[model samples]
Target: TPLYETLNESSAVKLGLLTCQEIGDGNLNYVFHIYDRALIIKQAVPPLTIDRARIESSALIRQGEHVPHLVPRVFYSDTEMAVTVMEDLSHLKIARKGLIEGENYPHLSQHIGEFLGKTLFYSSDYALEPKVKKQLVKQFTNPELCDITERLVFTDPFFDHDTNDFEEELRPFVEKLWNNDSVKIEAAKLKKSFLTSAETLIHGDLHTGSIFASEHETKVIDPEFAFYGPIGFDVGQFIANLFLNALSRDGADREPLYEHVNQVWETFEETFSEAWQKDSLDVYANIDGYLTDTLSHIFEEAIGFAGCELIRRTIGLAHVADLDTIVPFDKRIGRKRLALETGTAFIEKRSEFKTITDVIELFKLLVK
Candidate 1:
């Protein structure tokens, strides 16, 4: 095959004649995992826009040198073929599946907090010169993938759409959501914000599935959805997945899970602040309340986006196995209902809270 010949002859990495196998379980592109060098070769097919975007944005992060090793290292890329050869992370556990089976990683919150803080803050207007920042934004103009989120996460879930899928038993609950005028109104606002708020480079798809984990390590894989968007969107996306895990664990001690959610927000706020104080080039540094206000906005936006994430997974096109793993319709459908309720409340009331415990309290109230 040409792909094998390319690998065998390419100067990017030395290896024996490569034997490769397709390894993509994603919605876009084909990935070939090579055993010769623990390398992954990814090609963008119909939705190859995102695959190339990931390679480009990842190269930017690797160059920054502030946050190292969070993303896979790219060895080589081909623009004509829309393919990239990069490090393979098959050794790590998929965070979503691990969460489904009730696994815990003590370092996840800290690693994610650092990842978000360094990746977002450094690339944002706070750190970059205005001209450099705009150029960066222009570099990652991802209309195709961002449009997917605009529909799936923020728009389509609010209406009766053909793409929306859920358990049959939850039809009544899904209908109620579609009929709720307040839900649609708030969803519209979120959708507009998502369209316009290009605050920083967001991993547009930062759910548990995009995370690969082990007890000692946490690496964020798959940033194919990378784009300039609200800083809170990524923060919200991560915690929302935690919330899903919290609700789906019927009888397990969710104290740690809930605690981790709170800690992720806390760590993000604290670390983001530190980076801003030390590294931000913004001139408003002397303002007394500027940092607090910025952090506050991040929290509010995160809460709303998190709520949207939660609702979409329950009643929208995609779902997590945390709820799907619940065996009985009687049991599973109820969890989805509770998630719906929790998501609605967060979307409507996120701006009222000061701490993550406030969000957790609201979540418990609805889930209970």
Candidate 2:
């Protein structure tokens, strides 16, 4: 049992690629590093077929154009399913868990926002004549990829049952959420929006963990949700992740952690809005100055995206274990509930979120 028999034996590659570490996996994927800095192989099993491969391909392709060289290059892709070998990202550490001793990092937020701008801004190519809008749409809509995001990720947990692994802490949240008449109705609305909001090319799932950050380098990976959608989903996922961490701000004195989390959030919000104004407007659509004259549409999208992000973290699979280890059990539960409630309010009232400023205001009221 060489830890992963399939990775070594399953691949018909003569067992030549040496193995490194088997990073913890998700419901449908397993990743391993190759020895001597050759490659990283991503393998998918049940519930993952061509879908996984398409996601990795689309994410890398969609992003590579804008960021130039942000994502690892793909040397080989098994179009069939679950077998991909791409340039290794071993150079960086994944932020799946926060840094040591309750430290909070800020640079991670900055670079990620920049990546979002370049990758998203260049999608429509205001400069490229852009005759192939339909062709671009066809390439982006890889069926296998959409199933993972719109279905497996967003819809499966809430609407379908076969694939969910909802833990005990999340069961009540799920039931209460589905039972709430308003929540049910709004969730339906957002789900429809998620599938239909073909606003811009997105990183799909832009949380902290998807990023690899050091004091100097930054990268984002596993963008299985790389589709054309609301810009706010990408921005809101980043913000929702910060608050998700705050919800886990266990024994750390509330004042400090909250301060750090909110500070990072305020900076990111300002920057992203700036980027949208600077690039998403100037670089892409120019909006005819809609960003200034009719800021409400963009702001509403942000709130809606924020709401959707919050809901998934609460009731979806793959909840971060990063929340609340510092406090006693009872208090920890309270913090978790706080996150669930906060997300509920945001999504339930998406229209109210006319600006990142308005969204943050709602969050402040919740924590207070």
Candidate 3:
């Protein structure tokens, strides 16, 4: 078996009696846990390009260079076999499950912030030479997966597409969204940026389910969707997941989730700013107000992207457990409506928000 062969070649195991369990539930890959060996084997599903294994491995290696403890260590990777052998993080609960169970991780925001800041900044044009940045972009040109994101995230949810999934009660709101030309125009612009802006190497899919964490540690996983895209894309996606969780809760129970959203942006801003001060290669980046202006734009774009993510996750093909797992069908539909309304507001009024605080307050007002 490829799993045994991988373990054997990596020299991490003695090839004794081992038990393997398939654990991945995601549509794109098959993940096997090889117990007693402390290893994980992830193989891309067939017809999905094996090149994604290369992307995932390289992205993890790159992230390890900057934030070694925040990502998994690659034991071995084979592009031909489309398999990756890496550390087993079964000790930590998937952040999505933890949130759904009403568990909180105090250090999640800090770890995620640092992960986004260091990995994104170091890979961006401000940190790397022009030639090197361009080369890295070419190396990570993930067309197949990006196409998937473009359709599923920015397109399908906005129109009467066949990919959208929602209850009959959500039809009015979904139709409202379909008829909003202003929102569609803004979404198109954001999609354009996603297509053209090679600001950094983004995690591509940074939702809560992609993270493994506990009270003190976090490990970001599944960068098969990793590619050169806007920094805000990752930031917004993470924030959107937090919003999804918060929306899943009762009004009085959502404070921590809101705080998480704020902390993630704050930590990312601080860490990115600190890194920019010490290591930015661009002279123009050192200008007095340039950082502030740049950060503002990033925040604005993040709001817009977060809005898109909220809408898509609610109605698009991939639904999140935060909203999906709620008891009582009527209550679930109501939360989905909140997601749609909040998402639309975030996109349409994204540029108007001055801070994360404003965004959270708006969420409070809307949810009420």
Candidate 4:
């Protein structure tokens, strides 16, 4: 019935819409498949899940179309019903799922860099008129979803909260983390920055789980957590997710993961600069310090955020399958220990690294 209304009778009949079934494997939303997975129906409800409840995914999806190739075009919506129709990307596997299964995506870093650079900068004060940017900020103010991150990402993971879930073998490490005053203090500062820094309109949940891709293309989705936040938070979250995969890979297969993570930042800085130079009021070529300083600050911020994300995934409630889905018990524990060791080390000493390559060196050191 809903399929007929979303598509014309002739179109629905042609696509075999009668064989509809639910396809979404996520916890928060109800997603349905129709026309043999040719079209998707995503509807937000007051989810029983604590994380990412009360989402405005359709609203954010509609706004996201301004950035080219970032999201599928929204075809139909009923706000009262909280349902939206989209071009199903069944052809593209979920990025995290693919990576966990040991797949290579040659174009991933460049595509993501372009997506982050264009979408974030264009929607920020760097590109938009001041008043327009401020209005846009208010348009995406999502306190409920942001609150979830405030707690889950920045708070709950650091404490003995009920929502927290640690691997049984990780108790000693988890205990050390819980009792580390320095780590707790620094985490507080990072959390403060997240709470206060409203630099740009960010795809606040831009993890690999939110990306869909094949060898040739990538598409980002699920900005239900979209908000005004630190640009580094968005950039760092994406890279940190990859670091988890790299940490879990066999030594022979690990090089590509490290290379891909490195490429993401390099491409992001280049693509982001291109956007800024084109849209900036003044010529950046005339003011070298301005460009250099801005990039350095964002890079520093990105490093800190990446460290936080790395730690949270290893010890926190939400775990990535790359580490969680490893086959053997010993291998899983080993990789997880590496993740915790590197994450804590990075968080404790993020300021020591100058260039992104320096950070890569740090990752290598931890691995060794």
Candidate 5:
């Protein structure tokens, strides 16, 4: 907290900056504001290292090259200290104002699909050369970052958690999941693959909390863990956050809000696949079909990894505050189950899910 109280700034630069209050998206980093424009100074509170910080920065930079303008540009960074100062985009909104009202985000998936298409197009084999890709991988390399991601977000919390700071309603879901051997087996398999394979440059944490949304903008932030991870992590994060919001509809007027929420989920999957197809075939001009199969594989793998992540967040040390935090018991449990079932559909049917209707049908079943 003293990061803000002890804040200091010099006035000589004409653009005088005051060490504003410390800001953070999660427990891992602290941000400071300055003058009219926020400097967005950051330091990792999580147990990560320098090289990993470098990769996170470089990967973000690489992502900006291809992804939509929804992403903030990295203005500067210190590899040794694991500090980053980037274009501040922490205050935008894209989700339809349903989450706070217990409604779902209508445009989330479609907007994210646009972002995923552009980002994947420029970063992958389509637009990147072998030499360029190799250099990018080198620029963003960090061992400690990888280790922590392996443990906290990917492996440890999924099997069981000791750091969950969430509501009591989540315990039932967590306990039930813990008792299921098949979920554990699937999670372990996904975690192992997510760790070793540099599938694609991922946002790493692309949930709703990671986005700043307003009427005109949807800016993504907090890429401290950005790396060569599964691409679907980014995609899944977008959809999962919407589903989480839907799960918060635990009240008298739950029907309309959750109904809209289902629309969001269905639209997200539909647009995601459509964007993948559009980018892979036409945007980059893949006449040879050389990248066609590779693109499909990337999309499938990324979605699977994302689905697994969705399941974990629903019942891990890092539970979302959307549904569980609600006070009333019946609404809380009902919404949690709704969100949980939607998350289930993602993992169970990801492979069979190349169409939008298929996703909607899954939701129809959940509601029914």
Candidate 6:
């Protein structure tokens, strides 16, 4: 109610007849769409820290600087109110909803890769001065939200934690994963990396649900989980969501999803390499073969993180609609099993992957 008054006073919305509706499906915040004005008002809900509003707004602003067209424009932010007023993207479909409905966006992968490359690279130590990067790390110190990721994404699925949610039929497979020492060990290492590595300003939650897209235009939203973390975490989460969509489909129908997976990484690699050559602020990064080495490690971590996402969505607190909405409970359980098996393989054999093709091939083998 008063939010509209705030918007009307600001440059974001004109003083005219406007309608507001709560449209948030996210777990942490309330998102309101002000109809007829094309503005969105998002407020962080209680029990969660209000500082997330600051984090989301700042992340959007910083990301907009590098890849302006890939993120929504933030017109106003109030940390005290835990709210952000920004451009509305209701015209574009949520990428997760589109994928589940068998819709495809030809440019989605390229847009996502570019978003990752430009935003992550520019905020990183290779592009920013050491002091500036440290300031950013300090600005985005998010402990409460990171704890959610640490427990829900990387830790819960590895053990029989209370946060995990799965069917009784899936108990045996879930138990198998819990008993597998290698998966647990790799998961622990990834959790530690997620805890410690502050490589760049990552869109900590990059699932398809966080994206808005048409055939040619894409925009990333909801960086409330934004933090300075591993570059691969963003890449891995995006790829894992794509794979989840593919896994929801029958054979032969899933090919395009794989193509999207391929294109996303390929575009990110090319774009990141090009940026490193032209924009890297660090001299050491310009050395021959250095970019290659850095990307190789990013790819391996991406695989491991992707595996963690797959396993977590299957049994952990938050489930993806792509897998959950499938007809026939038995069929859904079968696909979820494949998800666990594939996720375990990814966590354990991530280092073995040499290319995107290798990741896809291994995924195909596991699902088959």
What is the clash count for each candidate, in the order shown?
0, 2, 0, 0, 12, 0
Each candidate: RMSD: 3.2, 5.0, 2.9, 4.1, 5.2, 3.0
Clashing pairs in 2: 248-323, 248-324
Candidate 2 lDDT, 1-368, residue by residue in tens: 22323454335334334446656456466776666456677876554344555667766866776664557776666655456677777767776464434545556655665676566556643322345544565566655556566654356545536666544665776677666777667766766777786656677777778877666677788876676676556766776776677666544434443453445445544654565555542343454655454345545555555566665665565566655353677665666666767877877776765545566667767876
The Cα error of candidate 6 at residue 3, in Å, is 13
lDDT of 6 at 57: 93
Better of 1 and 2 by lDDT: 1
lDDT of 4 by residue, 91-177 (tens): 899999998888878888888888877777777777777788788777777778887888888888788998887778888888888
Q: Which stretches of candidate 3 lie over 4 Å from their true place?
A: 1-17
Q: Which ten residues in a row have the lowest lDDT in candidate 2?
A: 1-10
Q: What lDDT would candidate 1 get against the real structure?
A: 0.79
Question: Candidate 3 — what's its lDDT?
Answer: 0.90
Q: All candidates' lDDT scores?
A: 0.79, 0.61, 0.90, 0.76, 0.57, 0.89
> Any runs in candidate 5 off by more than 4 Å, and if so which?
1-19, 25-27, 36-38, 50-53, 90-98, 101-107, 161-176, 250-299
Candidate 2 at residue 346, lDDT? 76
Candidate 3: clashing pairs of residues: none
User: For residues 1-368, what per-residue lDDT tens digits would candidate 3 score against the true structure?
Assistant: 34323222233222232567777787577788877357888877655566788899989989999999999998887777677889899999999999988888988998999998899899999999989999999999999989889999999999988999889889999999999999999999999999999999999999999999898889999998989999899999999999999989996689889989999999999999999999999989888999999999999999999999999999999899999888799999999999999999999999999999999999999999
Question: lDDT at 338 for candidate 3?
Answer: 94
Give the candidates in order of lDDT, highest first.
3, 6, 1, 4, 2, 5
Cα TM-score per model: 0.91, 0.77, 0.95, 0.89, 0.76, 0.95
- List candidate 1 stretches off by more than 4 Å: 1-18, 47-64
Better of 2 and 3 by TM-score: 3
Clash pairs of candidate 6?
Answer: none
The alpha-carbon lDDT assigned to residue 112 of candidate 5 equals 58
Residue 302, candidate 3: Cα error in Å is 0.5
What's the residue-level lDDT of 7 in candidate 3? 28
